Every structure is written in structure tokens, then in C-alpha cells.
Write a protein that binds this DNA or RNA. Structure first.
Ligand SMILES: Cc1cn([C@H]2C[C@H](O)[C@@H](COP(=O)(O)NP(=O)(O)OP(=O)(O)O)O2)c(=O)[nH]c1=O
Ligand SMILES: [Mn+2]
Ligand SMILES: [Mn+2]
Ligand code: NA
Ligand code: NA
Length: 326
DNA sequence: CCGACGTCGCATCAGC
DNA sequence: GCTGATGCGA
DNA sequence: GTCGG
């Protein structure tokens, strides 16, 4: 948190450009700059010092100078004072509401938490649930609670079929003391890149987690990705745990390492690894790393037997999950 | 200067 | 119903 | 908004 003030300013500008301007690359430019400054091991003295960092250009250097001089930024100050920008920024915080829907709602005059609650009938299912647990989703999850959620999920998974392997990824696997949500990778020997010997492989796990009232809600559900809500069980007389977002991803068993690399993160790290992969002449997704031919079209999947193999291909020295927090 | 900016899953809509 | 685009999210 | 070429 050496440059907490700086990275906060940039993050707020990224949010503005994404939610209001709907300029996604501006959003990413700010997020990359915030990331590289976040891991800069010096307390930045000037915008020029920051300009040396990759991702920081002239315009951001000037804002860093203004911030360091006065303690704030006029551009952000004005944005904060604007009703439409402030209202749109807020509505996007509800899960399922993006830049488009937020702007749409404000146009109708729907622009407060209270405005939303009286207009429940104008939200889709995802947005409905996002509103429902708006407060709960603001809260972090302490690693202790994550550890409880881990054993529940992993044990419930064991009961449906002993051949299911469940791995908690995301920030948890990176050893975070607190997480925004729970991210779960799922593998079963009946599901490979070569066939699907069993239907409903993800459904049965969702079903089982619902039966024990762990999973409480569903945002979206397909044959490989579940997006929903879960809650820890509480003892007698004690207040309830907050409801928590949970993502579950069923990935073909033989493609585990690309999957576990993808879902481990971080978000920016994953974005950066694939960007670097392109520079090296590869393409990486959650399933495979494929080489790009002379024409630019991806070839056949390269063999992978570890997370490290993927690092080796794009000529990166390996980094532990706890060192991938960009 | 100026093109390019990771890659994919699910919900939902237009258009047929 | 399908396909392709768009919105939102991992 | 930034950058490689
Ligand atoms: C949001 C996001 C996630 N991911 C991958 C990397 C994340 O670690 C993984 C889980 O998504 P997440 O839970 O939204 N990110 P997290 O677990 O690292 O962070 P947190 O503790 O939930 O805030 O999915 C991307 O590859 N691109 C993205 O834009
Ligand atoms: Mn997470
Ligand atoms: Mn998640
Ligand atoms: Na730079
Ligand atoms: Na949202």
C-alpha cells in the first residue's frame, strides 16, 4: 500500500471509463497502470518516476503529479459531483447490472437502491438476486470462513461420486487472507476433451449442494459453469453468515492444468499472461495453449503436464500462486 | 503516427 | 426452434 | 490511455 492513494485514483478512473464512458480499453489502460504501480516497491515521488513504468504514459503521469501536489484530482472531483455518473457508477455495483443496463435505468429515473427495490419487476433474474444480496456481496470473506466452505464443498462433492476432484482456486489458492468470493474447479474422469461419458456432471454437484442448503441461489447455470450464491451454516442462537457469491467450473480432466492456471488468477495476471502469450506466438485459454502458425491461426494443443509447462512455453519463469497477485 | 488491446461461458435479444 | 450479436461476468 | 513497430 506504498502508493495506495495513486492506485485508488486510477482504479476509480478505470471504473468511470468502463461504467460511464463505456470505453473498455481506457478501463484496461487504467487497470494495468494501477497494477504495475501497486507492485512498485517505492513510494512514488513524481509522475515522471511513474512514467518509467510500462503502462504509465503521459496523461497518467500528469494526474499522478496533480494528485501528489494537491492530494486529489479535479477530474475525479467533478465526476463525483455529477449525478448521472454517480448514479450509473452505483447501479453497476449490483451483480448483473452492467454499464448498459445502469444507464438504461437512470434514464427511467431508477437510480437509487430504493428505486430498485420498488422496481423489482424490471430486473432480470440475475439482477434480482444481485439486489437481494447487495449488502452481503459487499463484504469480504475471511480465510477462516473460506476454509469452512472448502471442506463442505469438497466433502459434498465426495458424496456424489468419489472420483470428483474439487479444487478451490481464485484468490484463496493465492493464499489471500480474505476473498471476494469462492471459486471452485471441478474435474471428473467421465469428462475429458475426448468425450463426455456422463451428462449432468455439474448438475448433480449443484443439486447436492442445494440439498444441504449450502447453495441458496442461482445466477446462471450451464454444463460447465455455475454462477450462484452460497451460505455457511450457523450454530444455535447465533446470527447468520452473510450470503456469498460462488463460481463453479467443470473442466475436462485432461485439461486440468490450463484450467487451474486460468481460475487461480489474478484477473490482471491472467490477462497479462495471455497477452504475453500472443507476443510469444501462442494463444491460451482455460483448456489449452495452442501455437499460432505463420498465418495467425491456432494449431493443435501442446502437451501440458503442469502449470509450469505453460510458463515454459511463453518463456516465463514459474511463479507460485501467491506470487500471481497482479 | 496508429492499430491493437485475453478469451471464454451463460442469459437474452434480434432476425429468420 | 436456430444462429449470431450483445451484455455481463469468470 | 498506452505502446510497439
Ligand atoms: C474477473 C476475471 C476473472 N478471471 C479468472 C482469474 C480469477 O482469479 C478467477 C476467479 O475470478 P474472480 O473470483 O472474479 N477473481 P479472484 O478470486 O482472483 O478475486 P476475489 O478474491 O474474488 O476478488 O477467474 C479472469 O481470467 N478474467 C477476469 O476478468
Ligand atoms: Mn474469487
Ligand atoms: Mn469468482
Ligand atoms: Na511507461
Ligand atoms: Na454489476
Amino acid at each position: 500500500t506504498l502508493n495506495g492513494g495513486i492506485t485508488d485514483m486510477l482504479t476509480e478512473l478505470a471504473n468511470f471509463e468502463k461504467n460511464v464512458s463505456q470505453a473498455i480499453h481506457k478501463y484496461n489502460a487504467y487497470r494495468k497502470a494501477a497494477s504495475v504501480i501497486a507492485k512498485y516497491p517505492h513510494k512514488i515521488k513524481s509522475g515522471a518516476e511513474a512514467k518509467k513504468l510500462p503502462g504509465v504514459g503521459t496523461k497518467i503521469a500528469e494526474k499522478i503529479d496533480e494528485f501528489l501536489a494537491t492530494g486529489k484530482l479535479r477530474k475525479l472531483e467533478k465526476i463525483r459531483q455529477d449525478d448521472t455518473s454517480s448514479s450509473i457508477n452505483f447501479l453497476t455495483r449490483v451483480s448483473g447490472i452492467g454499464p448498459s443496463a445502469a444507464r438504461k435505468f437512470v434514464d427511467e429515473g431508477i437510480k437509487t437502491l430504493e428505486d430498485l427495490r420498488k422496481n423489482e419487476d424490471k430486473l432480470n433474474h440475475h439482477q434480482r438476486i444481485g439486489l437481494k444480496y447487495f449488502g452481503d456481496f459487499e463484504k469480504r470473506i475471511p480465510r477462516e470462513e473460506m476454509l469452512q466452505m472448502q471442506d463442505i464443498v469438497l466433502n459434498e462433492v465426495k458424496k456424489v461420486d468419489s472420483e470428483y476432484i474439487a479444487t478451490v482456486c481464485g484468490s484463496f489458492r493465492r493464499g489471500a487472507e480474505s476473498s471476494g468470493d469462492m471459486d471452485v474447479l471441478l474435474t471428473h474422469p467421465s469428462f475429458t476433451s475426448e468425450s463426455t461419458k456422463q451428462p449432468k456432471l455439474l448438475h448433480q454437484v449443484v443439486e447436492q449442494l442445494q440439498k444441504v442448503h449450502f447453495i441458496t441461489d442461482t445466477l446462471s447455470k450451464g454444463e460447465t459453469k455455475f454462477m450462484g450464491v452460497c451460505q455457511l451454516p450457523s450454530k444455535n442462537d447465533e446470527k447468520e453468515y452473510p450470503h456469498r457469491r460462488i463460481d463453479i467450473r467443470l473442466i475436462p480432466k485432461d485439461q486440468y492444468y490450463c484450467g487451474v492456471l486460468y481460475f487461480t488468477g489474478s484477473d490482471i495476471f491472467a490477462k497479462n499472461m495471455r497477452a504475453h502469450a500472443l507476443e510469444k506466438g501462442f494463444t491460451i485459454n482455460e483448456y489449452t495453449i495452442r501455437p499460432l502458425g505463420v498465418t495467425g491461426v491456432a494449431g493443435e494443443p501442446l502437451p501440458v503436464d503442469s502449470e509450469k509447462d505453460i510458463f515454459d512455453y511463453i518463456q516465463w519463469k514459474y511463479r507460485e500462486p501467491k506470487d500471481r497477485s497482479e
